[PDB]
């Protein structure tokens, strides 16, 4: 690359690892979205919410691919593993699993930021701080509030009222 | 008929049978609609929904009459039997009976499609596949989702919330 | 019913009888509408007219069901008999049979009004007078004028001119 | 062709045969259109109708040429034979000859559909069913209704009234 | 499932297999899109085209998941394999590999249609014919035309002119 | 014909001959249009141009039929011969063959004008001069300019640039 400058190989490898992590999270959210679309579950606003989350994680992966091309590195793709479960239980269990996934993703992003800071890469630490860390903190807070409200309303008619009211 | 071509008599008889089946389904949905309009039941959005379903089944019967005239056959009408019940119980029992009626209608439509396929009638198999089979699959899925939500919300205030929220 | 007041059982039975009469008239007009849609008859404006008449008779039956629920009675449905003929001859014969059907319906409505008057039911006699008797008189007059014009124009080109001009 | 897949040579030959049949039908309708434009016949709306029918048959032939190029086959054109008659008699005789031509075309289309079904060509059977069979059934029904109305109105002033009224 | 009717398990397994095939094709097109985004390749309209193709294949996979839920089956997801190459050579080699991928996908779709036809599943054969087969034929034709034009213009300034002109 | 005046039979026969010549030219241009639509040729603007030329030649033939009916003659149609080639080579060879066809048509039109002038038919010589001769001269000039530009740009990328630029 004629454009490559102050971009070490360890940082390039860590960016490729984060790309695979974002693609796996997108595929997990797609699985959850079509679990709540089943005819014996039938909570359509929750399914639409998880479909939007899947699209957002795919956008995160493509923006990391774009900055990898911008700095003069090379994108190397790996296999995307299938999700851990085919069915996700009640709505409370699914939102708790989603919260755990968001926290795992936040820990991976902080490790990537630490590697880029150790190799004195100012542009990439600023990129990560501007586009990923604040969005991840807000996503974790949103899922924690939804878990608290699902614990409040309880099963049955509270779950129906939550599906009708929380996403409009 | 000057227009009749590749239209056997068995297919004509099966089309007349399907016309009577659609008219019976319309009259059953009219009975359900005015059961939920009673002053001691008083669920108006469910009653409006079943009135719309009755109008839709009448439209299905008239479109079958129109294609019978289009192919050069002759419409032969029979008696329309009264519905099996005068009162339909709770909302869950009524929607379960409606789901069973939709599945019976789907089985009759598949038998008509099989007869038209056995007599090498390409236009009528394409007509049935385009206008009836996909609509019937979507109707069965809609009634199954409504049965699942009525099992979720339970009786009483859940039934009131279902009547207020599900059809708007 | 908590709402029932000054509504005797004989009046309720007569209202159910009138409901079945209106549904039978709707099904007769549907048969006439699809007779004139045949490819060897081919008078489309007459067929559209009889389709509108069928929809109107269905509306009459549903309004009687609504007032039965309003007064606190219970709707009891019966079988709908098939029409007397499959084919209706010339246009003059069909309009004469339609005129005879309208006069039969008017005689049934007058008998219902007489029963409600004998049982001192002021609301139902006023309902019948405001919604059914004047409309029935106007319908009989319209069919008599159409029979007179069909006798005037004669068969053939007069029938074609009648179909093109009378309903626009 | 780099695009050819699951497209046998017998199906290609049958598509070329159907192209020639549609072009012949277009040229027959052009002959009828300019017969009714003569100064001793002078029925202008019938002539305009047959001109539109000629344009429609030319569109059918060009859409078959387009799907032949789409599947990777090669278009092979043949001579277009002249129509059987120079003059077409009365309006009733011309519309009866047009009805016979439409039924011949429908029989050829059903034979093409049968060949494509015997060679397990799913895309072409769906193409024929979607774009040609229903349109052909509707065209045959339209010509049969016009023959019935021309028999009704008779010669002379009925023919003039038919030309003035039926196409507006 | 309360909605499942005339839906055998072999057809369900074949639908899950086709879902995995569409997801793999989407990931291959994403790899091609970010190959042409590199700073030493720099053909931006080709990269935008392959990004749109990746989004379209993802939409195909989600519509198959939706019809699997509609018929009462259960979605079972598998691993998505990484693409065969990291870099795709010249533009002609990349479009030839894309054409081969589209033809492989068409062969898989025809096998799925054959299985659904062997198990007498009328709704699913009509669904596949309406939504997938014609689109696949048009996609194969589009890629074959692009391969022919890339062979015509040659390398260098012809490749630049192709990137500037073909997608606007 | 009541309208025929100063219209000899030789002029009528020459008009019928010119009608057949225009229809043959239309069918040749249709063959060229679908040659350039092939997936291994793929020059879409040239194909659209030849489709428009085919429609224009059909309009020329129908206007000659109209003036034949206007003067009180009778249209007599003949067979339309198939074109000389199924495939037309490069773009330069196809445009050279089109130029030769236009010059043949111009020679036939001048012979028709000479016959009408020899029989002292003032209206038809004015008709031919106003509607056919100037249009034919402009068409020959347009095809000669396109042959000169196709010789200028050469094969390959020049042919691609010609297809992209010359018709917009
Ligand atoms: Fe993310
Ligand atoms: Fe129905
Ligand atoms: Fe009435
Ligand atoms: Fe046609
Ligand atoms: Fe796809
Ligand atoms: Fe010309």
TrEMBL record, chains A, B, C, D, E, F:
Keyword Transferase: no
Domain of life: Eukaryota
Keyword Oxidoreductase among record annotations: yes
Spans through the membrane: none
Single GO molecular function: ferric iron binding
Reaction equation(s) it catalyzes: 4 Fe(2+) + O2 + 4 H(+) = 4 Fe(3+) + 2 H2O
GO biological process, any: defense response to Gram-positive bacterium
Job of this protein: Stores iron in a soluble, non-toxic, readily available form. Important for iron homeostasis. Iron is taken up in the ferrous form and deposited as ferric hydroxides after oxidation.
Family the entry assigns: Belongs to the ferritin family.
Name of the protein in question: Ferritin
Source organism per UniProt: Caenorhabditis elegans
């Amino acid at each position: 690359s004629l454009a490559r400058q102050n971009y070490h190989s360890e940082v390039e490898a860590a960016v490729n690892k984060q790309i695979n992590i974002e693609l796996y999270a997108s595929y997990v959210y797609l699985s959850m979205s079509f679990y709540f679309d089943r005819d014996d579950v039938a909570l359509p606003n929750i399914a639409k919410f998880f479909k939007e989350q899947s699209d957002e994680e795919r956008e995160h992966a493509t923006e990391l691919m774009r900055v990898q091309n911008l700095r003069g590195g090379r994108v190397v793709l790996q296999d995307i593993q299938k999700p851990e479960n085919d069915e996700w239980g009640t709505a409370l269990k699914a939102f708790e699993a989603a919260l755990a996934l968001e926290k795992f993703n936040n820990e991976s992003l902080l490790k990537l930021h630490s590697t880029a800071g150790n190799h004195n890469d100012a542009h990439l630490t600023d990129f990560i701080e501007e586009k990923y860390l604040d969005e991840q903190v807000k996503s974790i807070n949103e899922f924690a509030r939804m878990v608290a409200n699902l614990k409040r309303v309880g099963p049955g008619v509270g779950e129906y009222v939550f599906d009708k009211e929380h996403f409009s």
